[PDB]
Every structure is written in C-alpha cells, then in structure tokens.
Amino acid sequence: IKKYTDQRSLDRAFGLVGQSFCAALHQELKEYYRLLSVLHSQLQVESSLTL
C-alpha cells in the first residue's frame, strides 16, 4: 500500500479518479496505523506480552 502511494504522485495524470481512489486508500492506510498505536502501548510499562 505504501509503494502504491509512492506511485500515486502526479500533477493529475490520466484521470481525476485515479489518485482520489488512493486518497481513500491513504485513509485506510491511516486506519492501520491507529491499530498499531494500541499495540505499542501494550509493550512498555505505564496484560501479557505473548504472541
């Protein structure tokens, strides 16, 4: 998904739909990062650290 957003960079080339598709895909990339923000708060001290 991250290399798709690296290929996303255009002025606005061969389509107004193409990168606005990826604008929502960066939103769904963004939702993955918040679910990573709950994981690391488990790791430090401030549950079990099992796989």
């Binding site: 996303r8 960079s9 255009l10 002025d11 606005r12 080339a13 990168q19």
Partner: protein
C-alpha cells in the same frame, strides 16, 4: 535527546551538527551516544530543516529581484510553515509529559512533512531558475497547483489565492 532534534529541525547551528548559516552543513558524527543507524536518520531529519532555512532567506530577501507579487507570494508561504510551527509546539508537551520517549515518533511526524517540504522546494527552485518577475509567478504556481498531491495541491492553491487577492485589489481600484 528530545530537545536536540526539535531544535536541529528549527534550523539553528550546533557543534555536533555544525552549520555556518543558510546553505552549508557538516555532519560531524564521531558521536558516542548515537548509533550508526541513528545518525543516518538525523541526516534524514536535517534535510527537512535544510529547506526550512532555504525558505527564510526567501523571506528576508523580499520582506524587511523586485515586484509587488513577490511579497504577495510571501504571505502565501507563511501559511505553509504555520501548521509546521504548530507541530513544533505539540512536540514540546510530548517531551514534558514523559521525557523518556525516543525519536521515532518525531521521525513519524517528519515523514508527514516529507512530501510537503521537497514538493515546495522543487517549486521555488523552478521559480528562481527561470528568473520570473510579476504576474508570471502566478502562472508558474497555477501550473504547479495543476499538480496533485492533495495536501500540496491545496497549499499551492492557498499561495495562489493570496496573490490572486492582490490581482483582485488591482481591478477593484482601477474601476
């Protein structure tokens, strides 16, 4: 080393990151308390502070060639550093709530600036290499706002909108 990296990001010199002023850099990593991986990212973090002082020289030359749209382009560029500097003070309370957090979140906020800061630096370099003067900066930024990058295409439309207001001044006073 929480305060050392926010302040290497503001653009001011040091003697670990030795900097003369506004163009030149020596990395000077004979450092014991950073790792060989961690100096590579400080070079990644300095490249976003290098173009920030390549930016204030574009201010002080025009504020404080010539033309009435050069400083109309200046109050476009202060708006692109304004959430930048707003992000600089939100990192400050991050270092006060817990002063043990490492540098990767600061790396994370600056990967967010990683596609705003070169994408405006390629704009000003294309501006100064054609030696533009007058209305044709506004046409240069109009085909730069022809590009995508949805955070950046709004940003080059905000720099477009403020110097279009100086155009909007002109035909209002002329009529």
């Amino acid at each position: 080393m929480i305060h050392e990296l926010l302040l290497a990001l503001s653009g001011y010199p040091g003697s670990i990151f030795t900097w003369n002023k506004r163009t030149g850099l020596q990395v000077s990593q004979d450092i014991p308390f950073l790792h060989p991986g961690e100096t590579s990212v400080l070079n990644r973090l300095c490249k976003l502070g290098t173009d920030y002082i390549r930016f204030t020289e574009f201010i002080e030359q025009y504020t404080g060639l010539h033309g009435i749209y050069l400083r109309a382009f200046c109050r476009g560029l202060d708006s692109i550093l304004q959430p930048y500097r707003q992000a600089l003070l939100d990192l400050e309370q991050e270092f006060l709530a817990d002063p043990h957090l490492s540098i990767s979140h600061i790396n994370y906020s600056l990967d967010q600036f990683h596609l705003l800061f070169p994408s405006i630096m390629v704009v000003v370099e294309q501006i100064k290499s054609q030696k533009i003067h007058g209305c044709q900066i506004l046409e240069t930024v109009y085909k730069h706002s022809c590009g995508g990058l949805p955070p950046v295409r709004s940003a080059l439309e905000k720099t477009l909108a403020v110097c279009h207001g100086v155009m909007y001044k002109q035909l209002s006073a002329w009529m």
